[PDB]
Amino acid sequence: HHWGYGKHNGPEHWHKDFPIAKGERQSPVDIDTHTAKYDPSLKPLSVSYDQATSLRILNNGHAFNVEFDDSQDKAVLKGGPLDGTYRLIQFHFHWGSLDGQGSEHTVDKKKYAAELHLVHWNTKYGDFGKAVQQPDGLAVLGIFLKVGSAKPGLQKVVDVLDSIKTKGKSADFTNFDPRGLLPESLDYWTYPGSLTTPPLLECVTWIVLKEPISVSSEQVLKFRKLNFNGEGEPEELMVDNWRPAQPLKNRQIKASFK
Numbered sequence: 001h002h003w004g005y006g007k008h009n010g011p012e013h014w015h016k017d018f019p020i021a022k023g024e025r026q027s028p029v030d031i032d033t034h035t036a037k038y039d040p041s042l043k044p045l046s047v048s049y050d051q052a053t054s055l056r057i058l059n060n061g062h063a064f065n066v067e068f069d070d071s072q073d074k075a076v077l078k079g080g081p082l083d084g085t086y087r088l089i090q091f092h093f094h095w096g097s098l099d100g101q102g103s104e105h106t107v108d109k110k111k112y113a114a115e116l117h118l119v120h121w122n123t124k125y126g127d128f129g130k131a132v133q134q135p136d137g138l139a140v141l142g143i144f145l146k147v148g149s150a151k152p153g154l155q156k157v158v159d160v161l162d163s164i165k166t167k168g169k170s171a172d173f174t175n176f177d178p179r180g181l182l183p184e185s186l187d188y189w190t191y192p193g194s195l196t197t198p199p200l201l202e203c204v205t206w207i208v209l210k211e212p213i214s215v216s217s218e219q220v221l222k223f224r225k226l227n228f229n230g231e232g233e234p235e236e237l238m239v240d241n242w243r244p245a246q247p248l249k250n251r252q253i254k255a256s257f258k
Ligand SMILES: Cc1cc(C)[n+](CCc2ccc(S(N)(=O)=O)cc2)c(C)c1
Pocket: 089, 090, 117, 119, 128, 129, 140, 194, 195, 196, 197, 198
């Protein structure tokens, strides 16, 4: 049995198979807004998802992935603290069993109901595989979810979860526009970190948006109906698949605004 989010295989156990879990630039982290400093050397962030092409949605037993075709330059993240172009490969979420928790990054210790992660890899490294062998191989755009009014652009994702309840299942999911998941403002905090799940590789430049999106109680409730287990296995609701905030150590979180 591999890593999970339970008492016997959760976050506090990961360091055993993945020692870097105790590394120098692990994620997530708490964002102390008062300590974060405005950085004028940051260029305007550029998110271009106009040509994005989704392919499939998958339940990997830890969350669900909406995968995109990254064989060409379509859906790229540029500017900000990033040098060059990063290509969108997939997006997934982290959520809790209750609205009071679920996000990985926290704001002044405040936990949101969930957190969306749009994953991109640095195109100068050929592909994802090579990218994860570099300190600047990845860029993840994090967006917080709070419970309130529904998010229209997230519904198509919500309605397909029925077809991928258990680990291993996947369903076709073309023509999904990730632009319908972004808040109005692109203000953000940024810092060098890592993947928040094993292998927990420290190759990520995190870009976390200040403004969160609102989703309905009904929508997040469906996220919670998913399973960690595979078909025909005792049911284990897919909830609280988030890693707690890790030590900041020698890092500074910069703000794109004021
Ligand atoms: C080929 C390939 C193999 C793997 C394991 N992955 C997923 C890796 C991964 C793991 C966790 C985060 S997260 N939670 O956003 O830090 C982002 C990417 C991708 C995107 C492509």
